[PDB]
Amino acid sequence: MNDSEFIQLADQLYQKIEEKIEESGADVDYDQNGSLLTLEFENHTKLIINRQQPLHQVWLATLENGHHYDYNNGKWIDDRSGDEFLTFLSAAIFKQSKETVDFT
Ligand SMILES: [Eu+3]
Ligand SMILES: [Eu+3]
Ligand SMILES: [Eu+3]
Ligand SMILES: [Eu+3]
């Protein structure tokens, strides 16, 4: 994967997260600031998603831990756990808002 393609895939990922938040009607605020996509919940907690172009990775920061994802198999995959990014994100959103956003 080159830089231009990573950009395409990551842009699609960010729009999908934003779109699915819209489909869901969930009370999750989103703001993209450059490479960052910040999700804020009504309890003032946050999930921060960051693009790292030179590594062709997407990074997620939860309240406890950081996670780094590769595009594998048409999906974004955690490089330690093998967990898929969007399944994991749905669960994190749920833990912090108890609202439900499906990205599948
Ligand atoms: Eu190529
Ligand atoms: Eu709206
Ligand atoms: Eu609000
Ligand atoms: Eu903005």
Swiss-Prot record:
SUPFAM superfamilies for the chain: Frataxin/Nqo15-like
InterPro entries referenced in this protein's UniProt entry, alphabetically: CyaY (IPR047584), Frataxin/CyaY (IPR002908), Frataxin/CyaY_sf (IPR036524), Frataxin_CS (IPR020895)
Keyword Iron attached: yes
Gene3D superfamilies: Frataxin/CyaY
One GO molecular-function entry: ferrous iron binding
UniProt KW keywords: Iron, Metal-binding
GO BP annotations, alphabetical order: iron-sulfur cluster assembly
Keyword Iron: yes
GO CC term, one of those recorded: cytosol
Family, per entry: Belongs to the frataxin family.
Record function comment: Involved in iron-sulfur (Fe-S) cluster assembly. May act as a regulator of Fe-S biogenesis.
Annotated protein name in UniProt: Iron-sulfur cluster assembly protein CyaY
Originating species: Psychromonas ingrahamii (strain DSM 17664 / CCUG 51855 / 37)
